[PDB]
């Protein structure tokens, strides 16, 4: 409906002017009016739709505005013509004898007298000053709204980049407050560059809070179901518990030659890999690279069970470069298990069985699960 409606409205608003005052045009080609004489916001709504549905969000407003401008030009032309007709004389008494040039000289006269430039005309009678004033104002209005739209678009376009430099130069001046050696400058610079590129944002958490609830769960269940809901340690329990466990997770990114488990430290964390590759190293010497995990793997899981890494981590680890592995701490584990004490007893029983087999036996891979993973069965069954 919109296409034909706007065509018809442009036609009926534009053809009539020259067909009421300009002398030799209303009977000359009287076919369009004769055969087409047969609170609006739908046009605005569908322009809104087209901006949304099509890549362009500016051509529609541009064409509407320039159509308004040329419509105003034509309407001013017609109204001064009718002012002359009502008064009898005036309004380009010499149109230069022909429609083919009458049209062009008419809108040339309109664009000439657009604001106040005058030129040829001289004071003839009353109301001329007021006439020139009104035309002046309408021209100024159209021009001003054009600049307004332009600055609108420029500002709305170049939005986050200014903030990006604001962060960067603020922190560089700060860090420079105390004369710190260059290495960390280079490190922080490349960190910032890599983060900013290919990501756009800087901390996706702040989007999560603004966005509602009850769909964040759907996002998390569409993203991180697999790797977690397969590990035998947390296997086979209340499905409605793991959801909070998931909801509290946090990302991090490392760089080349990055210690993560420097041997001889405590540790309280279970890492997990999303897109990268890390090497289980065997010391600063010739790289005892036993294996390098690829993706969808887990590491250091036992340390979350009542003792964080046994006051000394398993083995040294370093990274090639950019890793992007998630992180999950222990406080979350204890809080989720106290909210849902259904499985706290079974995880706890596994923990005592592990500590009781940590001293007297070795138990490489023979008695790990069946006595540990056996305790989930009856324990939560006692809920």
């Amino acid at each position: 409906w919109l296409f034909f409606v706007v065509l018809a409205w442009n036609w009926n608003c534009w053809l009539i002017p020259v067909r009421w005052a300009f002398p030799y045009q209303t009977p000359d080609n009287i076919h369009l009016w004769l055969l087409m004489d047969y609170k609006y916001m739908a046009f605005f709504e569908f322009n809104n739709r087209l901006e949304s549905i099509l890549s362009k969000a500016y051509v529609y407003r541009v064409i509407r505005t320039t159509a308004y401008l040329l419509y105003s030009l034509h309407l001013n032309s017609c109204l001064y013509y009718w002012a002359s007709a009502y008064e009898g004389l005036g309004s380009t008494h010499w149109v230069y004898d022909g429609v083919g040039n009458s049209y062009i000289r008419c809108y040339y006269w309109a664009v000439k007298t657009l604001i106040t430039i005058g030129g040829l005309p001289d004071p003839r009678t009353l109301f001329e000053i007021v006439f020139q004033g009104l035309n002046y104002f309408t021209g100024v209005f159209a021009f001003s709204v054009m600049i307004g739209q332009m600055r609108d678009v420029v500002g709305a376009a170049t939005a986050g980049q200014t903030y990006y430099r604001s962060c960067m130069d603020s922190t560089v001046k700060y860090m420079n407050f105390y004369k710190i050696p260059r290495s960390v400058q280079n490190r922080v610079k490349t960190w910032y560059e890599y983060t900013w590129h290919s990501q756009g944002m800087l901390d996706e958490s702040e989007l999560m809070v603004q966005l509602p609830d009850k769909m964040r769960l759907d996002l998390a269940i569409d993203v991180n179901y697999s790797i977690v809901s397969k590990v035998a340690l947390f296997q086979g329990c209340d499905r409605q518990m793991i959801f909070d466990m998931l909801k509290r997770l946090r990302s991090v990114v490392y760089l080349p030659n990055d210690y993560v488990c420097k041997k001889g430290e405590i540790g309280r964390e279970m890492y997990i890999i999303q897109a990268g590759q890390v090497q289980v190293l065997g010391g600063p010497d010739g790289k005892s690279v036993l294996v390098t995990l690829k993706a969808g793997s887990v590491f250091g899981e036992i340390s979350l069970l009542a003792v964080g890494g046994g006051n000394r981590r398993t083995a040294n680890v370093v990274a090639h470069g950019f890793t992007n592995l998630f992180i999950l701490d222990k406080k979350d584990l204890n809080e989720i298990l106290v909210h849902y004490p259904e499985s706290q007893k079974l995880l706890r029983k596994k923990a005592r069985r592990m500590l009781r087999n940590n001293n007297k036996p070795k138990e490489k891979s023979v008695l790990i699960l069946p006595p540990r993973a056996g305790t989930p069965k009856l324990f939560n069954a006692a809920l």
């Binding site: 604001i115 106040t116 430039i117 005058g118 030129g119 004071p123 009353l126 001329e128 000053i129 020139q132 004033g133 002046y136 100024v140 001003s144 709204v145 600049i147 307004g148 739209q149 600055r151 609108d152 500002g155 709305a156 939005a159 990501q199 756009g200 944002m201 996706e204 989007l207 603004q210 966005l211 509602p212 609830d213 009850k214 769909m215 759907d218 996002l219 569409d222 993203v223 409605q240 849902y340 809920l383």
Partner: protein, 468 residues
């Protein structure tokens, strides 16, 4: 000493303000437009010498209603003179009061009847004129026509002043001694106050729109004049465009924010490949959020009000249905108030399984407008409609002895359209009950009564109470 006082915000104030505007606006034009010409002065002074005195006496009256307006002390607005006046006498804004009423209509004795330029004082009572429509904007229905109307007014008065000045300078060299200046006048068709003014106005407007369709200067006094005129026209243009730009930027700050958020969510979604069904669902939820204009959240909309107003609005909006629940009947409202103060909304999407199976269900859910149904494990016909005010989840919120394997309801419920219900919490009910140690017994007694009358397996074991 008990004088009556007007309210400093009542409609009387507004109407008197509209009264005191006409005279100063009249004096801001007619004095100079009478100094310029001389064929209205000494020609129409009959009505003029009358119209002047009414405005003088209205100025005098203006000096009055200022001293009888109060100013609150401590929720109390002082309501007597002899100190309603001391502050006004001691402040500023009284020097103008001294100056701008002095009758100097005697200097005409040394200046005849051809100098109505002696009245260069009535133009100091302008703060009131400003304030009138500086303030009336906040009372109107919709602004954003008022600013442009004001700018139009100011520019028009400017051009009138300049059309005055041009004639004033013209009649100092001789009518017709040049070609730039106004022509000679003793000839006919020229000099009857209908041509002596419109022509000047035309010339002034052309000159200040600065395009140059008039004969050029020749005498070297106006080489100053035209320069100054151009240097003022530029500033006029700058002011109008800057003002309209700020206006047009301000009245659109919602769409930009909404589009920025949709941008962020689109980028994040297409950063880790998710099923496209989620894209469809997410976008067909965002459009729903936008369409009924529900972008804001009830959490933060209300966060700035003082606490009390929040209390009254909350109690008004919802206590009826809480008192409509099938258990809370004989509850001291000194509890229901803090209970109501603890509600949090939930809003849902089509085809969401709320509980659907054996789970904990440790909350309280009451339905607003929306449709819910209870089904079996599979996608079959509904068994009951939770049409308009239905609710379950009540008995779960407590923990009574000898329950029927509590907090593991296995019913199957599901949303279809859009629901937007509300939620409560067990722990909060505990903490807000802590201070009324009498109802708890009644509540648990009623719960045991209903559970027993439900024909269920309450183990009904006697309590221990062995050690008090």
């Amino acid at each position: 000493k008990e004088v009556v006082v007007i309210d400093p915000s009542g409609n009387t104030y507004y109407n008197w303000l509209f009264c005191i505007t006409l005279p100063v606006m009249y004096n801001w034009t007619m004095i100079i437009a009478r100094a310029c010409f001389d064929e209205l002065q000494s020609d129409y002074l009959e009505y003029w010498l009358a119209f002047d005195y009414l405005s003088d006496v209205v100025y005098l009256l203006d000096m009055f209603v200022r001293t009888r307006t109060g100013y609150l002390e401590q929720g109390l607005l002082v309501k007597e003179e002899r100190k309603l006046i001391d502050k006004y006498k001691s402040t500023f804004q009284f020097k103008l009061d001294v100056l701008s009423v002095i009758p100097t209509d005697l200097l005409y004795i040394k200046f005849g009847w051809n100098y109505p330029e002696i009245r260069l004082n009535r133009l100091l009572r302008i703060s009131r004129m400003f304030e009138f429509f500086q303030r009336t904007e906040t009372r109107t229905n919709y602004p954003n026509i008022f600013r442009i109307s004001n700018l139009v007014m100011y520019i028009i008065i400017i051009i009138h002043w300049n059309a005055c000045v041009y004639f004033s300078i013209s009649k100092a060299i001789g009518f017709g001694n040049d070609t730039w200046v106004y022509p000679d006048v003793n000839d006919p068709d020229f000099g009857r106050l209908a041509r002596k003014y419109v022509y000047s106005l035309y010339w002034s407007t052309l000159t200040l729109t600065t395009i140059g369709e008039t004969p050029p200067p020749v005498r070297d006094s106006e080489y100053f004049f035209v320069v100054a005129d151009f240097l003022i026209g530029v500033l006029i243009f700058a002011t109008i465009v800057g003002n309209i730009g700020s206006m047009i930027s301000n009245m659109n700050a919602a769409r930009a924010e909404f589009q920025a958020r949709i941008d962020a969510i689109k980028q994040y979604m297409h950063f880790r490949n998710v099923s496209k069904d989620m894209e469809k669902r997410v976008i067909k939820w965002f459009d729903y959020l936008w369409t009924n204009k529900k972008t804001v959240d009830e959490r933060e909309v209300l966060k700035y009000l003082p606490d009390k107003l929040r209390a009254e609005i909350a109690i008004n909006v919802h206590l009826d249905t809480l008192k409509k629940v099938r258990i809370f009947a004989d509850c001291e409202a000194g509890l229901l108030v803090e209970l109501v103060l603890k509600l949090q909304p939930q809003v849902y999407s089509p085809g969401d399984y709320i509980c659907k199976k054996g789970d904990i269900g440790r909350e309280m859910y009451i339905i607003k407008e929306g449709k819910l149904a209870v089904v079996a494990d599979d996608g079959i016909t509904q068994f009951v409609v939770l049409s308009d005010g239905s609710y379950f989840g009540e008995i779960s919120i407590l923990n009574i002895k000898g329950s029927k394997a509590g907090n593991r309801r296995t019913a199957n419920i599901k949303s279809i359209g859009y629901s937007d219900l509300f939620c409560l919490s067990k722990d909060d009910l505990m903490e807000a009950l802590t201070e009324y140690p009498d109802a708890k017994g009644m509540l648990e007694e009623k719960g045991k009564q209903i559970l027993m009358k439900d024909g269920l397996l309450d183990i009904n074991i006697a309590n221990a109470g062995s050690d008090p």
